[PDB]
């Protein structure tokens, strides 16, 4: 069992670093082979460019990134820092994303990590996406710390449902490539947590990773219910559309179908 | 009136760049003072660090960006790039974010732009946020070109409702700082769009800009319905919670209240 920890924070004194290192000690004691990826420490470049391709470009005039990136992968002409990361992606059974919440999403350095590493054919394919994604036998977690409390991200909060915020990350990025997303570890208002309570959070996180691989993941609508061709528009099957019309709740946050959204569908397991 | 355009594409030969240039010339046509912000061309730094503070750090031992960046702004110890961008904001009346949809969100360079430019005390404040935000006089628009199609992001699409994908950007980032978000300009299935069809998209976009200041912005639950208190935990007033009990719809995407979401809340204007 091998695991990969990705950390997007610039400081060592950060609670994210402490939250990272805690995961390491907890998993290593369980017999895990853990590798890390402090994005800031590596001086990782999150900005995609034509230099991501180390081979002869197919069209140096009109450059299209999703075209040259797929070709380079099949020929081994991606940037050496991207290939290095991809080797860790496949070798790792569990992937942990540790970061502070930043403007209702991941930090730029992490967003750019996704963009450069999740290259077509490697991470995803339209002939094998979501349920059939390359990373099927793999589980992903989100370990986030926010400045705001949990009430502010409640259904009756000022910012809105936190479930909505985590959707374009856990669904469209993680699950899209086959990943099984587990229940996110949410840390609301960490800047306002008493000293001896912070110490407890580290323990609840370390105890969790003792039996995390046997957890029940979040629910997504399986693609077995979609047409999955380019002429139908990848829409849902009418056999199912007529079935889901008698229900009160939608399938998921993005697959709500103009009706009620399942409580904590993106934070709590089904 | 002044307009700011923030372009996020590495390629000059991209349709996003065409969409930027066409938007520029259309505004200058109507006597707009147009300022541009080509991130890739500006070699903009998208990563936050203590390097963002040129002065002396309050605590180089235990460094915290949010609490340390607010200080530099107050005293004027911010990086020249950040300040040069913060001035373009304040000056302009209309902000346009031109970018390709990348992984169900914005490019890192644009995300980093938000992270370094939008600093506390300037862009936002716990007392002055959303409806009472600092940028409550200004308007913002999203101009997006996606790979997938409109049906893929339809309600029954494999990807899901675009309104959900657009919410954390428009509500959590734009509106949070006071902005008035207009109807996003979505260009689906680009690359599968014919040449003569791509020349018409530009003109229609240039036409919309003619009377875009007189458009209706997207709906967001007014902060008046909430108790802006920490003892109340910034929740909806019980007076308001008892009003929205006999209803079968929420107020927005993030304020669905476990109920239904108003159709096209993040793409189509109110009513
Ligand atoms: C650009 C930007 C955008 C942001 N956007 C958002 C947003 O949209 N929403 C939002 O809610 N927040 C936002 N934030 C705030 C951000 O979420 C918080 O700053 C972050 O979650 C906490 O930072 P940190 O995890 O590095 O911990 P720090 O703030 O560095 O540390 C928190 C506390 O943990 C303590 N600590 C450190 N190490 C240990 C240890 N080993 N044991 C015990 N205690 C320890 C420290 O004493 C410190 O007081 C944003 C911040 C930035 C910079
Ligand atoms: C890292 C990454 C993540 C992505 N994530 C997503 C995602 O989550 N969802 C999604 O849907 N898509 C995604 N995409 C795909 C992305 O949305 C498209 O590649 C992008 O929208 C293409 O837009 P462009 O500005 O590059 O235009 P281009 O694709 O460069 O332009 C297309 C065509 O327009 C023509 N053209 C250019 N200028 C003009 C002009 N002035 N007049 C007429 N024709 C012109 C060009 O000749 C070209 O053939 C992603 C891509 C990347 C690289
Ligand atoms: N850095 C923070 C922080 S912090 O904890 O690190 O200071 C916190 C933080 N949210 C956040 C901000 C303030 C407070 N609380 C807060 N704030 C002030 Cl200025 N005064 C008081 N005192 C106060 C005043 C009157 C009544 C009661 C009280 S109380 O102390 O008992 O809560 N409380 C609380 S809470 O946990 O106490 O509810 C969360 C944020 C951020 C952000 O950086 C940020 C960035 C972008 C968007 C949003 C945020 C953001 O929200
Ligand atoms: N880069 C691409 C590209 S590429 O053009 O740049 O090579 C292309 C591309 N896909 C992509 C690009 C163009 C179309 N356009 C396309 N094609 C056909 Cl055969 N028919 C129609 N008709 C059509 C026209 C308008 C509206 C709806 C429809 S409908 O077919 O969905 O009913 N449109 C269609 S389709 O789903 O509608 O078939 C997918 C994607 C991506 C992505 O990067 C990407 C990333 C994450 C998730 C998804 C994608 C992605 O889908």
Query: Domain holding B208: CATH number?
Result: 3.40.50.360
Whole-angstrom distance, CA of residue B143 vs CA of residue B9: 12
| DSSP letter assigned to residue A208 | H
Q: Which long-range contacts (CB under 8 A, 24 or more apart) does B39-42 make?
A: B39/B6, B39/B7, B39/B8, B39/B109, B39/B110, B39/B113, B40/A47, B40/B7, B40/B8, B40/B9, B40/B10, B40/B109, B41/B7
**Dist. CA A144–CA A153, nearest whole Å:** 13
Instruction: Compute φ and ψ for A120, nearest 5 degrees.
Output: -55, 150
Task: Give the integer Cα–Cα distance in Å for A63 and A130.
Answer: 28
Q: Resolution in angstroms for this experimental structure?
A: 2.7
DSSP code of residue B21? H
Q: State both tokens at B81.
A: 């790039």
Integer Cα distance of A173 and A88 in angstroms: 18
A235 HSE (CA, 13 A, CB side): 13
Q: Tell me the C-alpha distance between B268 and B182, whole Å.
A: 9
Is A219 tagged catalytic? no
Q: How big is chain B, counted in residues?
A: 271
Are the C-beta atoms of A175 and A142 separated by less than 8 Å?
no
**Rounded CA separation A78/A65 (Å):** 12
- Active-site position among B153, B178, B188, B255: B153
| Measured CA angle at A159 (ends A157, A163), to 5 deg | 85
Pairing of the two strands A2-7 and A185-187: unpaired
In chain B, which residue's Cα lies nearest the Cα of A63?
B11
As for how many domains chain B has, the answer is 1
Longest dimension (CA), chain A: 59
Residues B171, B166: Cα–Cα separation, whole Å: 8
Residue to substitute in A10, A148, A198 for testing ligand 1 pocket (most ligand atoms within 8 angstroms of CB): A198
DSSP 8-state symbol, B65: H
- C-alpha triplet A32, A33, A39: angle, nearest 5°: 115
Domain residues for the domain of B241 are 1-271
Method: X-ray
Q: Which residue of A has its CA nearest to B173?
A: A103
Does B60 touch chain A if contact means CB atoms closer than 8 Å?
Answer: no
- Find chain B residues with C-beta within 8 A of A223's C-beta: 158
Residue A188 Cα: closest atom of ligand 3: 36
User: Ligand nearest B100 Cα, by number?
Assistant: 2
């Amino acid at each position: 069992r091998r695991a990969l920890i990705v950390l997007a924070h610039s400081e060592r004194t950060s609670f994210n670093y402490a939250m990272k290192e805690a995961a390491a000690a907890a998993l290593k004691k369980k017999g895990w082979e853990v590798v890390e990826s402090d994005l800031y420490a590596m001086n990782f470049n999150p900005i995609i460019s034509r230099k991501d391709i180390t081979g002869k470009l197919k069209d140096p005039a009109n450059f299209q990134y999703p075209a040259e990136s797929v070709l380079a992968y099949k020929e081994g002409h991606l940037s050496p820092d991207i290939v290095a990361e991809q080797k860790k992606l496949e070798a790792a059974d569990l992937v942990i994303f540790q970061f502070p919440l930043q403007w209702f999403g991941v930090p730029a350095i992490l967003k750019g990590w996704f963009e450069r590493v999740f290259i077509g054919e490697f991470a995803y394919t339209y002939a094998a996406m979501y349920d059939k994604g390359p990373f099927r036998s793999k589980k992903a977690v989100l370990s986030i710390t926010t400045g705001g409390s949990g009430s502010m991200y409640s259904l009756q909060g000022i910012h809105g449902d936190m479930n909505v915020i985590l959707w374009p990350i856990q669904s469209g990025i993680l699950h899209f490539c086959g990943f099984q997303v587990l229940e996110s570890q949410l840390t609301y208002s960490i800047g306002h947590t008493p000293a001896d309570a912070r110490i407890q959070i580290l323990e609840g996180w370390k105890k969790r990773l003792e039996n995390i691989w046997d957890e029940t993941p979040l629910y997504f609508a399986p693609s077995s219910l979609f047409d999955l061709n380019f002429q139908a528009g990848f829409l849902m099957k009418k056999e199912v559309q007529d079935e889901e019309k008698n229900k009160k709740f939608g399938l998921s946050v993005g697959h709500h179908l103009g009706k009620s959204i399942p409580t904590d569908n993106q934070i709590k397991a089904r």
